[PDB]
């Protein structure tokens, strides 16, 4: 699976700035 390896760090470089907030 790429969706669990390769887009799993699109969170961690999305979530990052979206809950650096909340």
Avoid: C, R, V
């Avoid at 699976?1 to 909340?22: G, P, R, S, V």
């Amino acid at each position: 699976i790429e969706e669990q390896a390769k887009t799993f760090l699109d969170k961690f470089n999305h979530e990052a700035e979206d809950l650096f907030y909340q």
